[PDB]
Design a protein around this ligand. Structure first.
Ligand SMILES: CC(C)=CCC/C(C)=C/CC/C(C)=C/[C@@H]1[C@@H](COP(=O)(O)OP(=O)(O)O)[C@]1(C)CC/C=C(\C)CCC=C(C)C
Ligand SMILES: [Mg+2]
Ligand SMILES: [Mg+2]
Length: 279
């Protein structure tokens, strides 16, 4: 067990801590892609958790890795994570611009004021999650085309939308609402009121409006599953399927705004069995 192995095992532990659905799937990858995913995840985890000066420190670590992949650096932020990311960058082509976009998005979030329209909202989904799909693309496909990026991007954006749809209650408590002003007006919905009084029909309708968008994007990703390498196809499908099942869970908890619903480990294995057998 080397120095490097210790970095990756740390990244892995971050991933298992913060993301039960994605680790479950992505730990099924062959060892070398598995480790690249752990490392990208943990960098994005840390960027997302930044908050100020830690975030600039990370941005600086990333920029050194870009300009000088084969040199030793004295990383300012988290050395275990940065070392692993740099090890990954030596063997794979990484879209640095895509981590800067994510970093910009976390900086802008400081000044978050609700989205006027669905197009600002989809613009944020790109920034938090569409970028992650882009950074992962060369790890999960052997030939990167524009098509491969487009599919990875859309997968990530629709996972963010599913995340939003799950976290409606806890997001309100943290003073955030991600549904667009325009769509809240149209459906006559006020999130404060729902939170206090329970679900109603206007809410379900607005909710299901977005759920249908996420579902349509999901189905469009699945019909293009082929852009990914053969070993990653069933994993990616698992990861997406698990995340989509979050949608059925929300409806069975009656769209509650007072708990985080989840897909249990036993359900995860059942979906894996299903995908597995189709392959
Ligand atoms: C690198 C990796 C797997 C994840 C990166 C974790 C990142 C970027 C955090 C900073 C930005 C944020 C807030 C992202 C939200 C992730 C919710 O996870 P998390 O909050 O940890 O767990 P949960 O909320 O479920 O408990 C999100 C929904 C985007 C997931 C998009 C993916 C996976 C692209 C898939 C495309 C292909 C697989 C081609
Ligand atoms: Mg969330
Ligand atoms: Mg999240």
């Amino acid at each position: 067990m080397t120095m490097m192995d210790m970095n990756f095992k740390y990244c892995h532990k971050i991933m298992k801590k913060h993301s039960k659905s994605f680790s479950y799937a992505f730990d099924l990858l062959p060892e070398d892609q598995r480790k690249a995913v752990w490392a990208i995840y943990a960098v994005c985890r840390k960027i997302d958790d930044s908050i100020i000066q830690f975030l600039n420190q990370i941005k600086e670590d990333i920029q050194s890795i870009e300009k000088y992949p084969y040199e030793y650096h004295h990383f300012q932020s988290d050395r275990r994570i940065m070392m692993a990311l740099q090890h990954v960058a030596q063997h794979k082509n990484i879209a640095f611009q895509s981590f800067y976009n994510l970093i910009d998005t976390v900086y802008k979030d400081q000044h978050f004021t609700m989205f006027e329209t669905d197009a600002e909202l989809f613009g944020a989904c790109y920034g938090v999650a569409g970028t992650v799909g882009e950074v992962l693309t060369p790890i999960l496909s052997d030939h990167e085309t524009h098509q491969t990026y487009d599919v990875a991007r859309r997968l990530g954006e629709s996972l963010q939308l599913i995340n939003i749809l799950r976290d409606v209650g806890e997001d309100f408590e943290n003073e955030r609402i991600y549904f667009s002003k325009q769509r809240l007006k149209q459906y006559e919905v006020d999130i404060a009121e729902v939170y206090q009084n329970g679900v109603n029909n206007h809410y379900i309708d607005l909710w299901e409006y977005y759920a249908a968008i996420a579902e349509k994007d999901f189905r469009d990703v699945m019909d293009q599953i082929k852009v990914f390498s053969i070993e990653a196809q069933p994993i990616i499908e698992l990861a997406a399927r698990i995340y989509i099942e979050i949608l059925d869970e929300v409806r069975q908890a009656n769209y509650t705004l007072h708990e985080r619903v989840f897909v249990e480990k036993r359900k995860k294995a059942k979906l894996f069995h299903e995908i597995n057998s189709k392959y």
